[PDB]
Write an enzyme that holds these catalytic residues in place. Structure first.
Site, short mmCIF file in Angstrom:
data_model
loop_
_atom_site.label_atom_id
_atom_site.label_comp_id
_atom_site.label_asym_id
_atom_site.label_seq_id
_atom_site.Cartn_x
_atom_site.Cartn_y
_atom_site.Cartn_z
N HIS B 81 -150.28 40.68 -23.92
CA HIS B 81 -150.72 41.66 -24.43
C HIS B 81 -149.46 42.35 -25.38
CG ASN B 112 -147.15 36.40 -21.82
OD1 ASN B 112 -147.93 35.87 -22.40
ND2 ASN B 112 -147.04 37.83 -21.80
MG MG Z 1 -146.61 39.85 -21.78
#
Ligand code: MG
Ligand code: MG
Ligand code: MG
Lengths: 289, 293
Positions: B81, B112
């Site tokens: 995201h 991430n």
């Molecule tokens: Mg992430």
DNA sequence: CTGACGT
DNA sequence: CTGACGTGC
DNA sequence: GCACGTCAGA
DNA sequence: ACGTCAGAA
């Protein structure tokens, strides 16, 4: 409110309108994303001369995101126009605007002067059979399969500005018989690799469906076009036949007569060197008589 | 005799507004170009839980140009995201929209969960010292120079939809002390590679000038920002220091013991922690409160 | 915190 | 037609 | 360097 | 669709 307090970031993808073409510019790649033009019989006639033009940066582009001639000069790639100068004989201004680098992509020499040139000739040939021809052209960076089986997009960038060198070029051709004709519209989409291509491949070999090109390019072309309007494949209602070597070499030599001295015989020796026939070519006398 | 007779081709780059973020989508790459977000103290406080969220295509993106979960799952890349769920504890609706695939890029798993996660933690830490923080995040596909001298952009595409995997991620951070103060604004721009990054690189090692990022990305960030005024270096007026291995591992361990639904699992968590010789007070208490079970 | 996979 | 490339003030 | 002259493309 | 499992020495 507060989220947009300092404004949304700018992508710069707005349509830019010139005299006889419009384009959307790609600021990251330093190339157009699409260039739309409209061709008619009267527009490909006139006295505009490209020898009075010169490639230059587009003053409307922020210079941080503009290409420059230093990027192309010495790179091994030619300056390839998307909206061709040959479509703007009617206006010195429209032709000169096609020499902005916002209209230019790095293109293979043989491709720009050969196969892609012949496709541009066929689009102008279509104005003999249709009153109005719309053309969208642009660059593509398409994926290939790697040795381990994964898919990879790979392309060269050139110069200090990292101008992107496309792997393929696309052209969408929309032709309308007349303003009042009830006939269907003719539509074709083509994708051509940015490399030397001879006379053996036919144009239909590089044809793709419009939906396919839209998924590959991330664009939607001619969005006002009615989807229930009768639209036929341009390869079915027309030939999509490019000029062969004899036609192409003959057409080029006819063009070359507008030259200045008596080097016409050297131009004439080249015609029998490739053993092209004696076409009328009466422009020889209309040039000197 | 009209060039725009059938309309100009659509590129789909118009800004899309959601509850607490906005983005421009790249229909060719199936990823956002930029994601703009704003955070404050109250926004990162709340009861919204990401366990009640699912990744899903953005229903406002034309399905022809949408990514799908089948492009991501099993690809070797994670769904990353750009606007994090952690910035939206205040609103379950805001957080759910950050799980739209229009907010997601293919991101290295370790990056991430590790270095990029710690950068997102620093952005929320900034709300303790600044009242308002703006962040623009996005992907990049940067060129590299081969041995033969020429420069090439290369990136993987994944799934049937050919979602572009970025080589790098960027983040631009704009922070305002207060809406009434006259202190100049703080700005930082950073470019990190889309790969595992340990704890050795300090955040300032990935800092770039805003002008260099704009040239690389083809974007103009914060166009209504007065670049003319004094704008301070965010790594000078502030720390630009991420959590270290001890603070980060401790943080994750305390949040892991709240999810101890097996006593043998709480015991395992204990063993994994004792490598780094850490013992804190809150975890001390929180361990026993869930150990008796 | 950020992500994933197995019934 | 499509371009680059070798000179010369 | 940047504007002309010459040359080339299955 | 929902409980587990993992993340620099
Ligand atoms: Mg992430
Ligand atoms: Mg050309
Ligand atoms: Mg400062």
């Amino acid at each position: 409110a507060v989220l947009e307090q300092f404004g949304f970031p700018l992508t710069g993808t707005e349509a830019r309108c010139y005299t006889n073409h419009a384009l959307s510019y790609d600021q990251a790649k330093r190339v157009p994303r699409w260039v739309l033009e409209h061709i008619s019989k009267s527009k490909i006639m006139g006295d505009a001369d490209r020898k009075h033009c010169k490639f230059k940066p587009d003053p409307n582009i922020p210079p941080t995101f503009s290409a420059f001639n230093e990027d192309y000069v010495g790179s091994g790639w030619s300056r390839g126009h998307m909206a061709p100068a040959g479509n703007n004989k009617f206006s010195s201004k429209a032709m000169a605007e096609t020499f902005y680098l916002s209209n230019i992509v790095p293109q293979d020499f043989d491709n720009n002067s050969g196969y892609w040139n012949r496709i541009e000739m066929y689009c102008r040939e279509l104005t003999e059979r249709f009153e109005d021809v719309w053309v969208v052209s642009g660059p593509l960076t398409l994926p290939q399969t790697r040795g381990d089986g994964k898919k990879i997009v790979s392309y060269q960038v050139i110069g200090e500005d990292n101008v992107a060198v496309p792997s393929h070029l696309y052209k969408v051709i929309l032709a309308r018989r007349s303003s009042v004709s009830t006939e269907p519209l003719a539509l074709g989409a083509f994708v051509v690799p940015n490399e030397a291509i001879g006379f053996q491949p036919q144009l239909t070999e590089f044809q793709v469906s419009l939906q396919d090109l839209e998924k590959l390019s991330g664009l939607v072309f001619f969005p006002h076009l009615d989807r229930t309007s009768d639209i036929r494949n341009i390869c079915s209602v027309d030939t999509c036949k490019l000029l062969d070597f004899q036609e192409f070499t003959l057409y080029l030599s006819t063009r070359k007569i507008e030259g200045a001295r008596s080097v016409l015989r050297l131009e004439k020796i080249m015609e029998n060197l490739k053993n092209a026939e004696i076409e009328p070519d009466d422009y020889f006398m209309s040039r000197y008589e």
